[PDB]
Amino acid sequence: HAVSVGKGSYATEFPEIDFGGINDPGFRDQQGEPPATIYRSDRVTGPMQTNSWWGSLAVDRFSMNQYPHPFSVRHRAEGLHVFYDAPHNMVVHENREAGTWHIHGAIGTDFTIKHSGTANFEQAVVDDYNDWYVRGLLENGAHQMAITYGVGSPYIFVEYEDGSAVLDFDIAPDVWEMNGHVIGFSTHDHKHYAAFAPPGQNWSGIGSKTLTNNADYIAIAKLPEKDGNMLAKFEQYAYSVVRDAVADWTYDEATGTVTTTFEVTTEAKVQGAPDGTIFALYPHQYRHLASSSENQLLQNYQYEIIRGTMIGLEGKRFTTELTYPGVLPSLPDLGDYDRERLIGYLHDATSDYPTGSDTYELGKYIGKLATLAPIADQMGEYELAEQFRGELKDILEDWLQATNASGQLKGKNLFYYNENWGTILGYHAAHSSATRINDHHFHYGYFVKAAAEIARADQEWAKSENWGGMIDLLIRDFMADRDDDLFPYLRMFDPYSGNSWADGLATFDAGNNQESSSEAMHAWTNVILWAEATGNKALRDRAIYLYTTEMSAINEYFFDVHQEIFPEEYGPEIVTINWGGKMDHATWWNSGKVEKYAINWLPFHGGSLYLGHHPDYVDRAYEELRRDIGSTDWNLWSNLVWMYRAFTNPDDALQQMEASIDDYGLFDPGNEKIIERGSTKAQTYHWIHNLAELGRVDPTVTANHPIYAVFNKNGNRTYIVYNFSDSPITVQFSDGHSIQVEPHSFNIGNGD
């Protein structure tokens, strides 16, 4: 059975897969479904949230190791293990022959939070969650322990049924402050914590390995320092348990400002407890803190974690402000290229084909075609552009239908709605996109790219009663709004951490991870273009919110542009994979040197200009990679490096491109030395030459519409706008400049 959505459809029964003769158990196991068992209480109904920092709690019987910074925690039969990575736990390791580096801590236990009545819970389940906290529930009949925690919370809130509190240590802690019902303590290795019980419920066991308390409520805090004034501050909010937490945003189109307010609602566990908490802010938040939140900062309240320094802030809410910088549907026709040569490369691209039947490889191919089409238009090759768009339509009109000619479900090239979790899965699948609900933004982002390029030339096709409904459905899978009947809220995105998490299950002792931040940014860019093309303001603004917030996380945790987060002894100028608990210069497959950088640059598209906002970073990263290679003889993906290099030095990029671009003949799946397989010569040539004429990205200038870019070459500014509207528009830039744009066109460099 299947459900119609305009001219398309999706499957509601798991299809009989067409393996196409392939016997490899790997490929066949990829054509499955996500886990049947979900560890959630009957309070958690509707589409299950995935791609979370906390997801292992939902998937494994207890949990794996999690990073509600500043803590790490894990659920066990015996209770909740709590740990903090102090500097003596932190390490930086290099494997020279592998070309990898690892910044990590340890899987230890500072202490265990336990229930007086049982050390043998049956399971731990998700009993509730919000935008960034979760409520874990350890269950053993009448015995329950409910633990509320989250990223950015220096508290762990503990609620007991049919028992009371126990804190268990391997080595007896130093209780340096005993206020009866509040204690300040330190581990044998000098890690400072506190525990809070209601007044009159005093702690026993002081001086021993086990601290007990008769209360049915306690809180644990990580203290920034061994300091009784801090303890007194933590005491004020220790009885205010977080029940709701919401990240509300606005996009002000006139200024480009994306404003996000993070707000909790708490429940008082003693008389008079304030409605509020103490937040621990990550760098990407506090570097952008609103003026009106500055007075809530607790200045000396600092935690060192993998993502650098966190700082304390008290109250009900705080606000961040970021600047959306615009995106483009593509670069315009402004380069000093040889036009017959670019036309030749466009014709050469007709030899390209997908190197796989799965959603990722197929996605890469349709991203390639979608990128060529507007370049072909610019060169006056409208037939060729139309050929590319036609191929896009045939592929999409296939994948977006679940049923064949006879009305039966297909065995491949279809989407299926898994009801158990509430997600759209594509078959053929790869990289655990269906078995783990991984990488939906990475894969489906390319499908939206394909659709946005079709919509730019053909609004009729993109209507919801036609093929638009199924495109809006894919988008909803990976970035649904609130109260969506089929999907959880913003699946991929962690509003507090500021980045997308790529693994649907998060069953790793380093928490969740994200490798290709650029493929995430690509997904958000394409939803912006799709939504602008189809007149969907609400959807567009949400993708703007995501593009802009994720940008802020990328610049800190992947690039460290400010040079404050990576340890000094860390050699690379990039982190490739960010986890909850660690950072890797490494890829998910066995790769060489360029790939461990370029996996956070690709693919290149009209939303990629964010990569050039920090020219010194771009120089610094390129120079480090060049030093490690020993030359400009790139081990793989040379064109991606040339393209990146053009952000700060297009002459040098031009020189490397001329020397080697034509070593590559026509498309060869087995050789990505020069041209990465999701990329083309045409794209490479068009991009570098455009950058050579335009100069540098100028993020200091904004516009009062969202599809634009500003460049600066030695003080001379080029302003670029694309107009998706049927009517002309006028665009005001923040430096006083004003331009007029005709319908369905760029303001300059439309080509022919």
mmCIF file of N, CA, C and O in Angstrom, residues 7-68:
data_model
loop_
_atom_site.group_PDB
_atom_site.id
_atom_site.type_symbol
_atom_site.label_atom_id
_atom_site.label_comp_id
_atom_site.label_asym_id
_atom_site.label_seq_id
_atom_site.Cartn_x
_atom_site.Cartn_y
_atom_site.Cartn_z
ATOM 1 N N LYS A 7 1.208 14.121 -7.690
ATOM 2 C CA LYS A 7 1.504 13.111 -8.720
ATOM 3 C C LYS A 7 2.415 12.001 -8.227
ATOM 4 O O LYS A 7 2.650 11.035 -8.957
ATOM 5 N N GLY A 8 2.959 12.152 -7.014
ATOM 6 C CA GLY A 8 3.867 11.160 -6.422
ATOM 7 C C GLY A 8 3.200 10.312 -5.358
ATOM 8 O O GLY A 8 1.987 10.396 -5.127
ATOM 9 N N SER A 9 4.009 9.496 -4.706
ATOM 10 C CA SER A 9 3.552 8.662 -3.607
ATOM 11 C C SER A 9 4.718 8.090 -2.823
ATOM 12 O O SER A 9 5.860 8.024 -3.324
ATOM 13 N N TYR A 10 4.384 7.647 -1.608
ATOM 14 C CA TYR A 10 5.287 6.922 -0.745
ATOM 15 C C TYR A 10 4.648 5.644 -0.207
ATOM 16 O O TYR A 10 3.428 5.557 -0.036
ATOM 17 N N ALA A 11 5.500 4.665 0.080
ATOM 18 C CA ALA A 11 5.050 3.358 0.528
ATOM 19 C C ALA A 11 4.756 3.381 2.017
ATOM 20 O O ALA A 11 5.443 4.049 2.775
ATOM 21 N N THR A 12 3.723 2.658 2.430
ATOM 22 C CA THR A 12 3.421 2.443 3.850
ATOM 23 C C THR A 12 3.626 1.006 4.302
ATOM 24 O O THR A 12 3.441 0.724 5.479
ATOM 25 N N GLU A 13 3.967 0.102 3.378
ATOM 26 C CA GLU A 13 4.403 -1.266 3.718
ATOM 27 C C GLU A 13 5.852 -1.370 3.234
ATOM 28 O O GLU A 13 6.252 -0.702 2.264
ATOM 29 N N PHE A 14 6.651 -2.165 3.940
ATOM 30 C CA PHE A 14 8.048 -2.356 3.569
ATOM 31 C C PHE A 14 8.086 -3.124 2.254
ATOM 32 O O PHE A 14 7.501 -4.201 2.153
ATOM 33 N N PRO A 15 8.740 -2.554 1.236
ATOM 34 C CA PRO A 15 8.697 -3.208 -0.068
ATOM 35 C C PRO A 15 9.533 -4.463 -0.113
ATOM 36 O O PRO A 15 10.487 -4.602 0.648
ATOM 37 N N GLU A 16 9.163 -5.369 -1.002
ATOM 38 C CA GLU A 16 10.033 -6.474 -1.368
ATOM 39 C C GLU A 16 11.190 -5.885 -2.200
ATOM 40 O O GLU A 16 10.996 -5.475 -3.342
ATOM 41 N N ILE A 17 12.379 -5.821 -1.609
ATOM 42 C CA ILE A 17 13.518 -5.142 -2.230
ATOM 43 C C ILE A 17 14.023 -5.913 -3.464
ATOM 44 O O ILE A 17 14.086 -7.145 -3.481
ATOM 45 N N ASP A 18 14.371 -5.150 -4.492
ATOM 46 C CA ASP A 18 14.979 -5.656 -5.695
ATOM 47 C C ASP A 18 16.478 -5.429 -5.511
ATOM 48 O O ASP A 18 16.990 -4.332 -5.751
ATOM 49 N N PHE A 19 17.164 -6.491 -5.091
ATOM 50 C CA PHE A 19 18.615 -6.476 -4.881
ATOM 51 C C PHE A 19 19.416 -6.434 -6.172
ATOM 52 O O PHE A 19 20.597 -6.111 -6.127
ATOM 53 N N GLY A 20 18.775 -6.737 -7.307
ATOM 54 C CA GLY A 20 19.385 -6.613 -8.629
ATOM 55 C C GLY A 20 20.539 -7.580 -8.806
ATOM 56 O O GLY A 20 21.573 -7.215 -9.377
ATOM 57 N N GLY A 21 20.378 -8.795 -8.270
ATOM 58 C CA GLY A 21 21.397 -9.836 -8.364
ATOM 59 C C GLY A 21 22.584 -9.744 -7.409
ATOM 60 O O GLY A 21 23.291 -10.741 -7.238
ATOM 61 N N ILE A 22 22.804 -8.578 -6.779
ATOM 62 C CA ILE A 22 23.961 -8.353 -5.885
ATOM 63 C C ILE A 22 23.825 -9.207 -4.624
ATOM 64 O O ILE A 22 22.778 -9.190 -3.976
ATOM 65 N N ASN A 23 24.891 -9.942 -4.296
ATOM 66 C CA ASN A 23 24.909 -10.888 -3.162
ATOM 67 C C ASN A 23 25.645 -10.398 -1.913
ATOM 68 O O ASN A 23 25.407 -10.938 -0.833
ATOM 69 N N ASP A 24 26.536 -9.409 -2.067
ATOM 70 C CA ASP A 24 27.291 -8.810 -0.953
ATOM 71 C C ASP A 24 26.385 -8.614 0.293
ATOM 72 O O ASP A 24 25.420 -7.852 0.217
ATOM 73 N N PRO A 25 26.677 -9.319 1.427
ATOM 74 C CA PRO A 25 25.791 -9.175 2.603
ATOM 75 C C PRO A 25 25.731 -7.742 3.147
ATOM 76 O O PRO A 25 24.719 -7.367 3.733
ATOM 77 N N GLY A 26 26.800 -6.963 2.953
ATOM 78 C CA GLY A 26 26.816 -5.555 3.311
ATOM 79 C C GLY A 26 25.726 -4.746 2.630
ATOM 80 O O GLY A 26 24.876 -4.138 3.299
ATOM 81 N N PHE A 27 25.749 -4.745 1.299
ATOM 82 C CA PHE A 27 24.747 -4.015 0.506
ATOM 83 C C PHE A 27 23.318 -4.466 0.820
ATOM 84 O O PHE A 27 22.416 -3.642 0.884
ATOM 85 N N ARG A 28 23.121 -5.767 1.011
ATOM 86 C CA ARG A 28 21.784 -6.305 1.275
ATOM 87 C C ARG A 28 21.275 -5.903 2.650
ATOM 88 O O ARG A 28 20.114 -5.552 2.780
ATOM 89 N N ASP A 29 22.151 -5.919 3.653
ATOM 90 C CA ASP A 29 21.802 -5.507 5.021
ATOM 91 C C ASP A 29 21.444 -4.031 5.116
ATOM 92 O O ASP A 29 20.661 -3.643 5.982
ATOM 93 N N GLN A 30 22.004 -3.218 4.226
ATOM 94 C CA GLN A 30 21.592 -1.818 4.106
ATOM 95 C C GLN A 30 20.120 -1.593 3.728
ATOM 96 O O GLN A 30 19.580 -0.511 3.985
ATOM 97 N N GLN A 31 19.457 -2.592 3.152
ATOM 98 C CA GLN A 31 18.076 -2.429 2.681
ATOM 99 C C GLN A 31 17.082 -2.911 3.752
ATOM 100 O O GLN A 31 16.153 -3.665 3.482
ATOM 101 N N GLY A 32 17.277 -2.422 4.968
ATOM 102 C CA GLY A 32 16.478 -2.794 6.096
ATOM 103 C C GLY A 32 15.741 -1.593 6.637
ATOM 104 O O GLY A 32 15.519 -0.593 5.938
ATOM 105 N N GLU A 33 15.341 -1.743 7.893
ATOM 106 C CA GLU A 33 14.575 -0.770 8.633
ATOM 107 C C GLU A 33 15.302 -0.489 9.943
ATOM 108 O O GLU A 33 16.133 -1.299 10.386
ATOM 109 N N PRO A 34 14.975 0.654 10.584
ATOM 110 C CA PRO A 34 15.548 0.956 11.901
ATOM 111 C C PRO A 34 15.031 0.012 12.995
ATOM 112 O O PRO A 34 14.020 -0.656 12.797
ATOM 113 N N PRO A 35 15.706 -0.027 14.147
ATOM 114 C CA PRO A 35 15.364 -0.983 15.212
ATOM 115 C C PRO A 35 13.889 -0.997 15.580
ATOM 116 O O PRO A 35 13.271 0.054 15.650
ATOM 117 N N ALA A 36 13.342 -2.189 15.785
ATOM 118 C CA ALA A 36 11.931 -2.361 16.180
ATOM 119 C C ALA A 36 11.672 -1.893 17.621
ATOM 120 O O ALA A 36 10.658 -1.281 17.913
ATOM 121 N N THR A 37 12.604 -2.194 18.516
ATOM 122 C CA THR A 37 12.463 -1.837 19.917
ATOM 123 C C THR A 37 12.931 -0.392 20.145
ATOM 124 O O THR A 37 14.080 -0.044 19.835
ATOM 125 N N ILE A 38 12.019 0.431 20.666
ATOM 126 C CA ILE A 38 12.310 1.800 21.085
ATOM 127 C C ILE A 38 12.070 1.883 22.587
ATOM 128 O O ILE A 38 10.947 1.643 23.044
ATOM 129 N N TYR A 39 13.121 2.229 23.333
ATOM 130 C CA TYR A 39 13.072 2.370 24.800
ATOM 131 C C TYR A 39 12.537 3.756 25.179
ATOM 132 O O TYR A 39 13.276 4.707 25.410
ATOM 133 N N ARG A 40 11.214 3.830 25.186
ATOM 134 C CA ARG A 40 10.484 5.010 25.584
ATOM 135 C C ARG A 40 9.306 4.594 26.443
ATOM 136 O O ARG A 40 8.797 3.487 26.307
ATOM 137 N N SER A 41 8.895 5.491 27.330
ATOM 138 C CA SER A 41 7.707 5.288 28.143
ATOM 139 C C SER A 41 6.457 5.576 27.310
ATOM 140 O O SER A 41 6.545 6.143 26.205
ATOM 141 N N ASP A 42 5.304 5.203 27.863
ATOM 142 C CA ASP A 42 4.013 5.508 27.245
ATOM 143 C C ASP A 42 3.610 6.988 27.312
ATOM 144 O O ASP A 42 2.622 7.371 26.708
ATOM 145 N N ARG A 43 4.381 7.809 28.017
ATOM 146 C CA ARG A 43 4.248 9.270 27.942
ATOM 147 C C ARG A 43 4.795 9.895 26.646
ATOM 148 O O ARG A 43 4.421 11.018 26.294
ATOM 149 N N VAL A 44 5.687 9.184 25.955
ATOM 150 C CA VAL A 44 6.315 9.686 24.727
ATOM 151 C C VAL A 44 5.570 9.099 23.540
ATOM 152 O O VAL A 44 5.778 7.939 23.200
ATOM 153 N N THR A 45 4.686 9.884 22.930
ATOM 154 C CA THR A 45 3.911 9.428 21.759
ATOM 155 C C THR A 45 4.199 10.265 20.525
ATOM 156 O O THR A 45 4.713 11.379 20.610
ATOM 157 N N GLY A 46 3.829 9.710 19.378
ATOM 158 C CA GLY A 46 4.047 10.364 18.096
ATOM 159 C C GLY A 46 5.403 9.992 17.496
ATOM 160 O O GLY A 46 6.092 9.093 17.981
ATOM 161 N N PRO A 47 5.782 10.674 16.418
ATOM 162 C CA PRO A 47 7.060 10.408 15.768
ATOM 163 C C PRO A 47 8.195 10.563 16.765
ATOM 164 O O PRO A 47 8.243 11.549 17.451
ATOM 165 N N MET A 48 9.069 9.559 16.873
ATOM 166 C CA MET A 48 10.174 9.546 17.817
ATOM 167 C C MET A 48 11.296 10.419 17.335
ATOM 168 O O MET A 48 11.671 10.398 16.179
ATOM 169 N N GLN A 49 11.865 11.183 18.243
ATOM 170 C CA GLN A 49 12.925 12.105 17.933
ATOM 171 C C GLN A 49 14.179 11.246 17.671
ATOM 172 O O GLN A 49 14.405 10.250 18.345
ATOM 173 N N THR A 50 14.951 11.592 16.651
ATOM 174 C CA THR A 50 16.205 10.888 16.330
ATOM 175 C C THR A 50 17.324 11.898 16.158
ATOM 176 O O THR A 50 17.116 13.110 16.321
ATOM 177 N N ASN A 51 18.514 11.408 15.829
ATOM 178 C CA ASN A 51 19.644 12.285 15.501
ATOM 179 C C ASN A 51 19.923 13.276 16.655
ATOM 180 O O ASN A 51 20.183 14.465 16.441
ATOM 181 N N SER A 52 19.871 12.738 17.873
ATOM 182 C CA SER A 52 20.007 13.464 19.131
ATOM 183 C C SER A 52 21.346 13.185 19.800
ATOM 184 O O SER A 52 21.930 12.123 19.602
ATOM 185 N N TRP A 53 21.796 14.122 20.636
ATOM 186 C CA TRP A 53 22.958 13.881 21.509
ATOM 187 C C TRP A 53 22.679 12.743 22.514
ATOM 188 O O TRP A 53 23.615 12.083 22.965
ATOM 189 N N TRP A 54 21.397 12.525 22.831
ATOM 190 C CA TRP A 54 20.946 11.531 23.821
ATOM 191 C C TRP A 54 20.388 10.229 23.282
ATOM 192 O O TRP A 54 19.982 9.380 24.076
ATOM 193 N N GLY A 55 20.369 10.058 21.959
ATOM 194 C CA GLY A 55 19.669 8.946 21.300
ATOM 195 C C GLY A 55 19.988 7.525 21.745
ATOM 196 O O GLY A 55 19.123 6.649 21.655
ATOM 197 N N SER A 56 21.205 7.269 22.228
ATOM 198 C CA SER A 56 21.527 5.916 22.709
ATOM 199 C C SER A 56 20.607 5.437 23.842
ATOM 200 O O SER A 56 20.432 4.238 24.000
ATOM 201 N N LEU A 57 20.011 6.364 24.594
ATOM 202 C CA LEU A 57 19.043 6.035 25.651
ATOM 203 C C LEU A 57 17.761 5.385 25.126
ATOM 204 O O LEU A 57 17.118 4.609 25.817
ATOM 205 N N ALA A 58 17.383 5.772 23.918
ATOM 206 C CA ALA A 58 16.219 5.239 23.228
ATOM 207 C C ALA A 58 16.486 3.901 22.538
ATOM 208 O O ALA A 58 15.543 3.173 22.288
ATOM 209 N N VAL A 59 17.743 3.586 22.220
ATOM 210 C CA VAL A 59 18.067 2.466 21.335
ATOM 211 C C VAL A 59 18.637 1.268 22.100
ATOM 212 O O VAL A 59 18.248 0.124 21.837
ATOM 213 N N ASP A 60 19.546 1.520 23.029
ATOM 214 C CA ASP A 60 20.070 0.453 23.857
ATOM 215 C C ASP A 60 19.214 0.353 25.107
ATOM 216 O O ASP A 60 18.559 1.323 25.483
ATOM 217 N N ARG A 61 19.203 -0.837 25.713
ATOM 218 C CA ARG A 61 18.417 -1.121 26.919
ATOM 219 C C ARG A 61 18.669 -0.071 28.019
ATOM 220 O O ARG A 61 17.725 0.467 28.569
ATOM 221 N N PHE A 62 19.932 0.247 28.273
ATOM 222 C CA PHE A 62 20.296 1.320 29.204
ATOM 223 C C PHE A 62 20.698 2.543 28.399
ATOM 224 O O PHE A 62 19.825 3.204 27.835
ATOM 225 N N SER A 63 21.984 2.856 28.318
ATOM 226 C CA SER A 63 22.449 3.852 27.355
ATOM 227 C C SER A 63 23.897 3.578 27.060
ATOM 228 O O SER A 63 24.525 2.781 27.731
ATOM 229 N N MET A 64 24.435 4.283 26.086
ATOM 230 C CA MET A 64 25.871 4.354 25.935
ATOM 231 C C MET A 64 26.293 5.672 26.526
ATOM 232 O O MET A 64 25.492 6.386 27.115
ATOM 233 N N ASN A 65 27.576 5.969 26.432
ATOM 234 C CA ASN A 65 28.127 7.155 27.046
ATOM 235 C C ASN A 65 27.612 8.397 26.306
ATOM 236 O O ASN A 65 27.554 8.399 25.070
ATOM 237 N N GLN A 66 27.215 9.421 27.074
ATOM 238 C CA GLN A 66 26.576 10.640 26.547
ATOM 239 C C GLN A 66 27.279 11.864 27.083
ATOM 240 O O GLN A 66 27.930 11.801 28.135
ATOM 241 N N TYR A 67 27.139 12.979 26.361
ATOM 242 C CA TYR A 67 27.846 14.221 26.707
ATOM 243 C C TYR A 67 26.908 15.405 26.880
ATOM 244 O O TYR A 67 26.907 16.323 26.039
ATOM 245 N N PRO A 68 26.108 15.396 27.974
ATOM 246 C CA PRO A 68 25.382 16.583 28.366
ATOM 247 C C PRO A 68 26.368 17.563 29.001
ATOM 248 O O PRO A 68 26.442 17.680 30.234
#
